[PDB]
Amino acid sequence: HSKKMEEGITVNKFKPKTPYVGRCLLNTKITGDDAPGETWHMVFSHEGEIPYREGQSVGVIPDGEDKNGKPHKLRLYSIASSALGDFGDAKSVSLCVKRLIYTNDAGETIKGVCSNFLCDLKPGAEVKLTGPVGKEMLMPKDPNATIIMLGTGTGIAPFRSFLWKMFFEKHDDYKFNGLAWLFLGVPTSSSLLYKEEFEKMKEKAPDNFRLDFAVSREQTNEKGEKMYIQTRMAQYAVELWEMLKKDNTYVYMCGLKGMEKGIDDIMVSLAAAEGIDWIEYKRQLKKAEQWNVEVY
Numbered sequence: 001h002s003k004k005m006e007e008g009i010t011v012n013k014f015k016p017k018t019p020y021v022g023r024c025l026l027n028t029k030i031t032g033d034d035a036p037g038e039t040w041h042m043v044f045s046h047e048g049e050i051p052y053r054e055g056q057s058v059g060v061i062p063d064g065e066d067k068n069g070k071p072h073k074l075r076l077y078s079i080a081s082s083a084l085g086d087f088g089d090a091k092s093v094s095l096c097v098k099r100l101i102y103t104n105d106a107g108e109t110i111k112g113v114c115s116n117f118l119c120d121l122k123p124g125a126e127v128k129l130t131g132p133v134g135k136e137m138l139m140p141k142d143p144n145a146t147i148i149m150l151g152t153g154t155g156i157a158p159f160r161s162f163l164w165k166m167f168f169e170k171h172d173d174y175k176f177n178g179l180a181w182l183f184l185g186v187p188t189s190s191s192l193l194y195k196e197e198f199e200k201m202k203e204k205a206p207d208n209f210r211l212d213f214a215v216s217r218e219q220t221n222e223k224g225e226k227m228y229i230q231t232r233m234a235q236y237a238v239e240l241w242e243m244l245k246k247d248n249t250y251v252y253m254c255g256l257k258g259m260e261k262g263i264d265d266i267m268v269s270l271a272a273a274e275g276i277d278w279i280e281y282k283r284q285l286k287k288a289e290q291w292n293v294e295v296y
């Protein structure tokens with residue numbers, strides 16, 4: 001029994017030993033110059049060979065060899081385009097990639113392998129893909145579901161996937177009529193990803209879509225606290241709490257591993273005020289497919 005759209009999904013049609021070789025169509029930097037670190041939206045051609053669904057991931061094998069002459073290990077990326085894709089023909093796949101740069105123990109700058117390879121791609125370059133992978137983050141079957149989406153940074157990718165399908169496409173068997181509520185936490189305004197597409201979706205389905213941003217370094221709450229995602233959520237504590245108690249409410253969380261703790265921290269308090277132990281309630285939601293997590 002699934003409450004999610006699990007029927008007929010494809011998984012691992014392509015594998016690390018026999019990846020699908022697609023080509024880069026476009027690669028654009030989607031963060032502003034201010035932004036701490038860059039994020040790029042890149043689109044690849046797959047000619048219909050990767051039949052993915054919204055919520056899934058692909059694996060990427062960056063070109064080159066590891067320190068032992070073997071091929072690099074794959075890295076996973078949530079797909080950021082809906083199943084029809086950014087061109088609406090089902091033949092392309094899009095990624096949202098943050099370029100990883102750090103400094104090691106000796107103070108030397110180190111570029112992360114797959115992220116820099118991807119962010120550096122030029123239209124026409126080839127890229128090795130595996131997958132599709134994943135079941136955790138598939139959409140609910142119920143077209144009148146209340147869907148709450150909590151993302152940080154690149155974790156916006158699967159919710160973009162969802163939202164294109166819900167609001168930018170016409171489907172013969174699916175018409176969303178519920179309430180979708182996205183919270184997106186980023187550090188700067190220059191780090192807001194796809195804001196312009198979400199603003200058009202809001203205009204289109206004002207009654208079906210709610211939108212909240214948490215820009216940590218630029219926003220504060222009354223106490224004067226930094227606006228983190230849990231910080232912005234708390235401002236709607238009563239409402240969210242109420243939503244969580246309904247059977248047709250589904251929560252999805254995606255992004256940096258850290259976000260999980262601060263959210264559990266708000267929730268623990270909301271629940272206890274009600275005589276509810278968050279740890280057990282959360283476990284029951286996870287079991288009923290209502291609390292869906294992918295952090296990395």
Ligand SMILES: Cc1cc2nc3c(=O)[nH]c(=O)nc-3n(C[C@H](O)[C@H](O)[C@H](O)COP(=O)(O)OP(=O)(O)OC[C@H]3O[C@@H](n4cnc5c(N)ncnc54)[C@H](O)[C@@H]3O)c2cc1C
Nearest residue numbers: 075076077078096097098100102112113114115154157296
């Ligand atoms: C399910 C899934 C979905 C994902 N979705 C996406 C997505 O949509 N977009 C995206 O950008 N990424 C996403 N990722 C992350 C992605 O898979 C890669 O891990 C990321 O792009 C970096 O890999 P890389 O090859 O560039 O880095 P690597 O060359 O693998 O470098 C990684 C290593 O960097 C080290 N490191 C990182 N920061 C520091 C620091 N400050 N100090 C010291 N060491 C450091 C850690 O030791 C780590 O093991 C996802 C991961 C998973 C599991």
